[model samples]
Target: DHWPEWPQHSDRTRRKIEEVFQSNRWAISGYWTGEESMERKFAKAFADFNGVPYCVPTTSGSTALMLALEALGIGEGDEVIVPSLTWIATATAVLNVNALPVFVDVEADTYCIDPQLIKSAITDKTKAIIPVHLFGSMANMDEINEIAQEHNLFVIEDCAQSHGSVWNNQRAGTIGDIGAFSCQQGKVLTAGEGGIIVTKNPRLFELIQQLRADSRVYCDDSSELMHGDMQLVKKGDIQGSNYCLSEFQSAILLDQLQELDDKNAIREKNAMFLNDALSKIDGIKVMKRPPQVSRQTYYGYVFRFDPVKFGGLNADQFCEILREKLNMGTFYLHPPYLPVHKNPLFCPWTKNRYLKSVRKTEAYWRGLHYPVSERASGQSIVIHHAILLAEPSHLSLLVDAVAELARKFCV
Candidate 1:
């Protein structure tokens, strides 16, 4: 009989679950009001991990992005630069803030926004740049930040995939004005459905807390002894909504955060092992990391292919052959190309008067080309780093699969 895949949860996770059940409190009672210990613990743990002064937990990673954008005062008529090659949330979050998302092309190697192109994209309307650390790879933050400084724009690092990734010894999130992380089920730091925003800026930190906590910052004068009344007194100054994380998720995440480093170490070892073995193979090139990027908490390992060397067989066909030979799931690649401006959701023509600047945005989109994103979508395949959880004994099988797939294309 085939052995079952190892579960992602650990004994510590179970223990935390039991502890939460024992407390009998399913959610945070108020803004640091009742049962606030869990939130405090989570904030401290996450802040320490990212080397930030403070962390504010939110309901989901999307909310983290929303709160961060709101804190930055990004709204109507403002524009935020985002990479074309990213999850829809990167752009959608800008829209949520009533700001236009200007999609920019990424670098060929890092699959992140090219700082070189950023200057040309900037205009009077640009307020911020959302640098997505795509696939656990840190963007060229040094260059990006320089551009941001010159233009006086805020840099919000979208570190959803790169929990433990380091760029020049600084954590990914700490380098920018504000960094947002996702702790959804598949993320490196998972709490099933949670998010956290990290920042060193005290004012932005305070604004973020209120934005995510229904526009009410916790005050020291509020008595912790009284639960119901304490919650009522925290009045909303800015318009807000409910986006607080539950105590249960926070409790579980505190336990999971403890294991993040260990898990990332294992994933890194596996990634390097695969990189070395695959490098020797013909017709394949592994993604390269910047020298300054001392460590990476890989979301997935990407493999690029040359169609001419592979006798015209594309990445998809190669992945199919490798899947059968290895008896593992096929490598995943990005979806087919769809520019943000072309996307139906952003078309103001569909609902006139909502976003009058859509015409200008559409004109801007026409002048830009996302060749890097298009190439990756068509010619690269990515294997989930989580697969490393399997036995090391499977390494040879994986190698054999790649070699076999190569032979078919070579002949």
Candidate 2:
């Protein structure tokens, strides 16, 4: 039997599919044009989920990030600080805005952007900071916010992996200036392909709407006659792209949103159980959530191996042995893409101009030691949700597998 992991779509989803197929209108026809009703319903549901005033849905999470950066007035010559430990999208999103991304190291415990390292990275050109809530764990937003305030930088929470995580009674996305969530196939909130952005700032919210809708915001009364067409003109404030979500994805998301809390509950229970069992093993340490974090949504279970406690085997070798013993897929953390300053795309010296500043940025790369990232990336191995979401009966086998691996690997 397989671990009945995510994408557990139920009959509710089937019913929605039937309903959509039966609809006279396939898409949002007009304000009075009730095409796919699922889009509006899902947007409201997602806004409520994140505890924010507004939510705008897009086709993908990367588009959500692009829109967020665009709405913030970030563009060429500006610098956005992002942790180097995250998926490439986090950094690429900044580059999409024609801004340079300043890479920072992450905390060993949380695997999130380290607030202690932020101030040193900020300069006159630094405009924003993107704290990715990696692997469903919330970042240290309180400290990150304080740093942002001191430097007048915007904080964009990347909640791509985290869905229902809460810290100090506040949800993950609500802690920053704007929070972006992904509904990719792998995310806890799956919709096959969809993205959402949440914000408390009305001005920014309105601007983001334009950013996603080709410089047009939908009017509540527009449905009266024009269906989905624009009703009133606010102002031609900023340039934008077309990143709207379709009725199909929204329908799936609407049904799925109702079960998010329950699914996350199951994940939370499983994570705690697995962490408790694995922590007892020697030479292995489970990742830690911050003290202020009240709840966590685990995307995967990662354990860092202490080479000194274990034999001299590297994380890769350790994973190999564990895979053979457990008969499961355990992979190491992603290696760094190298510092942004070293990236060819950002190298102004190659352009023959801006060489002085380019040299300055490159100088910071000299002898740069990301000891914690190096250790974690090379030594930490992760068990995906496929294993964690297994049935209760299947848990013993998984635990036994881990136990056996630990016993054999530990010195």
Candidate 3:
């Protein structure tokens, strides 16, 4: 049974690219050099799609995270609480701002940062908390927001993998102060490479806008590069970087945006069906979507792997057998094999000359541990979200194959 999973556009995207080049106005650079610009169009469209008022597109997701951190006043000596179970960019974004990332463990049930741990990780320097929608599933934002408000901390939802996912009829990014998203090639909404930050607060938006465009903002709808009209107007006093998204990427995104919800629904239906069937099998722990989750997008379909129930087959071998049976198993591992705290990059011994000078800088990664994220790293396997887009009947084959393999190796 040959299976096709996660395949993307061919001719559809090709035509859009052609139209962009033909226009010759391939950027949102300045006034008078373009018609209604693609970048601005995408920004507004994407903002509206999420029911947010502002969207600032960036060159990449990493840059978006950096700009968001900068806009929120997270800089040197600041501490940002983040899940150790995310792509390194989440933590690195804090580090980019010359700040520290206090890594917290994630929840096994949802593979998101555990809200309960945020309080314990907080310090006087802690300025913000970033909860990753680890793989397009909703985090327990209700609990997360409760904790943030209790501490007077800012909440920045890392929606890179969680675009279109919703909780209690509200979208993922809008629930927090500022939400950041990635539109890289592998994401559910691909644009080759792009990102956008969305927020309801205009002041925050202005700062964010200034950050991406050399401390300036297009203040109005005029076509002049002057101080008063269509030219880049000075928005704020603080300096920022140039992380503007290209018109080509934005153009492609506008096309992709139209189909985002429909595609998300298809993935959700398959995920729900798979969850119901997989939950019945002993030791096959399905991801627990909370009641507030009205919609769960998929970066990849993920669940836990209890080695004890699989006759000691670790996650790898278990996935091997599943692929043999179903021909479509991704065997995608969750998070990194180790928490970000355990990485050498985060170790003062490796980076700080002062710490190393005192002979006090030791490899200090082994003693501390994040239990929830540790289990997720070791025992979780995932299937790419695009695979879930296959015909509805295909999901049953996957579920059946998974159950059968688990039973075959059942202790």
Candidate 4:
């Protein structure tokens, strides 16, 4: 009941919201009026924060993935390798661009795409690999990168949940060729609904900027297009859609970005505390962070539940105990994302415009099964990140409640 509410905003964010309303330019496509758009400011700030050369702000995390795939020149007749245990958007974004997603299994421990499984999934049509940094763990980037290099495929890091996560001295998004982040309301850094694309490669950066802004990019260095207050000039031949982020969301994101690292530090402290206590109990296994992870940010504090140790109770039944017996009704304790093939929300065949080859491939994919992913989903229980933000006493109460349940229910 004492959990911290999500999307906590500061007074500065509210003040900036007021400023955006009075400025009369809410979208990037509006006439530039001497003042730089919030969208541009936030993009630059995000790029700097992530230590990337360029950032392209978009409408949602899904669009960010779509643009990233497009910038890499992946499309019809191509295949993208995505993990089975991630938000469906990771695969749906590929479908949106007329590409087929070749779903692969995740690592049993990290719930990220297994680099070993990626090799078997690749073919001549494979153009990219999207390794998601799921929940609290970063994917094995070094192995994934090496595999991508060997196969001559692009790598796109899905960092929707990991805002400040660090792996081997580098940020999660920067290690890949291009990184996509979600700034939706539930994320650590949020603007209600927005997304960002980060890349170190200048060529990919330029392509992404043009892809999101209707074949136009800001003339940052040249005075050739400096007419009145206009900053963007139509320069490329890439016909693109309007995936531009609104100024309102950008303003809020700029303010939220300032506090992300500090908040993540506190969360790491609390999560580590929970991991130590919870893992000590029988039948409970905390998802441990890899040794190479210098800094870990959690989207959901996660652990696996063993039913045999708890008198044949399943993960869903255990969640009911947290709500009913422990009175942790306000705290969300739930299962992880279903393997994409089994999820009701992920039927991409409904889209009529996909190539016949792509459409035919979906049938084979639908019947595919991932045993590890299925087992992980059956046993996994996630405590919302808000619980990690609460005081030590709250987490202590959680540990006590779970221990009591095991004592009462265990055979």
Candidate 5:
């Protein structure tokens, strides 16, 4: 089952769903109502698995992050640096609170923001950095961390795409101040719609917990290990919205969490094979991960389709045939981010005075070398990870098809 199709399940995926349905405590309310719950269990499991101490569940990845930023006090006049190559939500989450998202160019190979570009994008107003683990490759966290420390900027890992990615044995979300996950239907860890954040700071988790549930958080003063043994602070003390995940979604994720590394193993093996075979074709360049990244996960497997060497077929045309003829999963010629900075709602024209403070750096943003981001926008096509799950022969078909195309269109 190639990607874009809903995931195939082992007996485990179905068993958990059946468990959730039979539990009769589908609302995650089981956590507070003193019933055994996959919700609380998964929260603890996710955090522990990621090496983080705190976990907070939410209704969606976007809202989960919205609360995380709110907890960090990222408000108007704040600027968060991000690569101009992620899901638009990575930028809009900052904009939703009147903060500006400083767009930076991505690394040509990895399709993640270059740390050098991140350094250049920093200004006095910069408060945070959101580094997206694009597709399957993780960003250079060591460099991103050094830059954030130099600037005193908080780092938020946008891990919506890199579910099982690792750097030096550390999980993607835990490396930053807050890590957000999406269990949306299309995601590898699908649950229809759900999200969670993992962090080391319990107080900050409490703060985000406040924003997640109308300023209320789950209180378990007893410190016991029982599921659903906590009580809720119904009378919220702060202004926030209901961003809670249902127990049903949590249960869906609970079992899948166990399946992650195994599934990731398969994708990695096939992806590595593709990298080897495709590289021989010269025009098809597969991204190489740095040594620090001990594990890799693919929501989408992107590669650079160099038009100069590929007989001018360009990314879109190359992908068109690879997908339509070879029956590979879907392919797209753009990075997920499409210039959030220049969007009218976030641009200078939106409100001159509010943007006036950022005017000193206005030219910088306008002149930013989105060259790599822009180049990726036109020269890259990525397919879903599901394409990598079949037997090695299936992977060979893809490489052969790609090799044939490159030969047919040789420059």
Candidate 6:
């Protein structure tokens, strides 16, 4: 088995769900119940975990991104810089907010945004830069922050794939001006479907709170009954949407958050084992884990395959062989992120509701090429983090399978 099946829940997780079910407060949008809402509790817990002063839980990662962009006042005539290699939602979230996503190429080794290319991508219209901590790797935030400072641009860290990854001395989400996380089932921290925004700025925090809760925010009363009531004070200063995270999702996420570090530790240990073993094989190259990344929580464990060393076998062929040799019925190996600009899901032209200028920019976006991203996507082999959560013995089967393949295929 590739470890226990993913989304492993504890008694606490089950117990929390039951509590939320019986609590009569399923959503924050509803009337204030006598008890504090799970959303507020999760917000506090997540903020503390991420080392941020504030957190606003949202319905999904997509909405979390859009909410960040909106709270930052990024809309029409603004451009948000993003790496080409990421989930479609990274670009789609920009589009949803009527902002153009200017795609940049990623580094060949790290599969993250190439900081070297970021300066050239910035323009007069650039308002924000979203550097994704793709897969298990993190973008160079120091350089990104420096560039953002020079240009007066907002920096939004797409921490959807990286829950606990650390760069330098800081956590992934806490490094940028605003951090957005996904609690989708496939993520390291999951509640079936959820997301949260974290930031250090109090003004931005208030804006996020209002944007996430339909222009209403949790009351500031420090009194026991009012705080216990968990009522939201109406603040109609800005129009907002109903993107609040449900009580059930918040409850589940709180439990998942408790165990995130432990789960990451398991994945990290097995990954190092795979890294060491796989590096000894001639045709395989493990992903680069830089010194700056003190801790990398793998959303997916990635390694590169060299066709020349593997008897002309492409990445897909090598993966096919590796999977067959492992004999895992549920095990899966796949390619890395496609360049978002070229992905089939990035068709903004099909939507007539978008601004005319936004729709027309599709040509400019579609014509762009990210050569490094193309190479990285084609040559990389991905094993989901849950697979890495397997026992060391199970991981050894992977190393052995690859070594055997190298011996057979390498002439």
Predictions: Cα RMSD each: 3.1, 3.8, 3.3, 2.0, 3.7, 1.8
Per-candidate Cα lDDT values, in order, are 0.76, 0.74, 0.77, 0.85, 0.76, 0.85
State the displacement of the C-alpha of residue 162, model 1, in Å, after optimal TM-score superposition: 0.5
TM-score of 4: 0.95
After aligning candidate 4 to the native by TM-score, how far in Å is the CA of 201 from where it should be?
A: 1.0
Candidate 3: list runs displaced more than 4 Å: 222-231, 329-337, 343-362, 365-367
Q: Residue 313 of candidate 2: its Cα lDDT?
A: 68
Q: For residues 1-411, what per-residue lDDT tens digits would candidate 4 score against the true structure?
A: 556778797789999899898877888887665577898788888887887788888999999999999999888889999999889999889988889999898888888888899999999999999999999899999899999988999999999999889999888899999999999888898988999999999888778888988888877653343335666778676767788888899999999988888888889899999999999899898885888999999988888878888887777777787767545544467778678887888876666676666756556767888887777767878877766888998789888888998898766
Candidates by lDDT, descending order: 4, 6, 3, 1, 5, 2
| Residue 46 C-alpha lDDT in model 6 | 82
* Model 2 regions lying over 4 Å from their true place: 24-32, 222-235, 329-369
Task: Please give the TM-score that candidate 1 achieves against the real structure.
Answer: 0.89
Ranking by TM-score: 6, 4, 3, 1, 5, 2
Please list all clashing residue pairs in model 3, or write none if there are none. Answer: none
> Tens digits of per-residue lDDT for model 2 on 345-396?
5443333333344334445544346566546656777666546666656666
- The residue-by-residue lDDT of candidate 3 on 1-411, one tens digit each, is 445545366666678778778766666664434456678878889888898888988887788888888988877767899998777788778777777778888887887888877888999999999999987567788898999898899989899888888888888899999999888887887788999899999888888878888888875755443332244577666687777777788888888887889988988888888888888888888888888987888877887767788787766776777777776544332223466666554554455532233212444444557888766656767877777777878778878887887768765
- Winner on TM-score (3 vs 5): 3
The alpha-carbon deviation from the true structure for residue 50 of candidate 4, after best TM-score superposition, in angstroms, is: 1.0
Q: Which pairs of residues collide in model 5?
A: 3-386, 28-247, 31-228, 86-337
TM-score of every candidate? 0.89, 0.87, 0.90, 0.95, 0.88, 0.96
Residue 96 C-alpha lDDT in model 3: 72
Candidate 1 clash total?
0
Tens digit of per-residue lDDT, candidate 6, span 358-411: 766667767889998877767778888888777787788888888887888766
Clashing pairs in 2: 30-33, 30-227, 30-228, 31-222, 31-223, 31-227, 31-228, 32-223
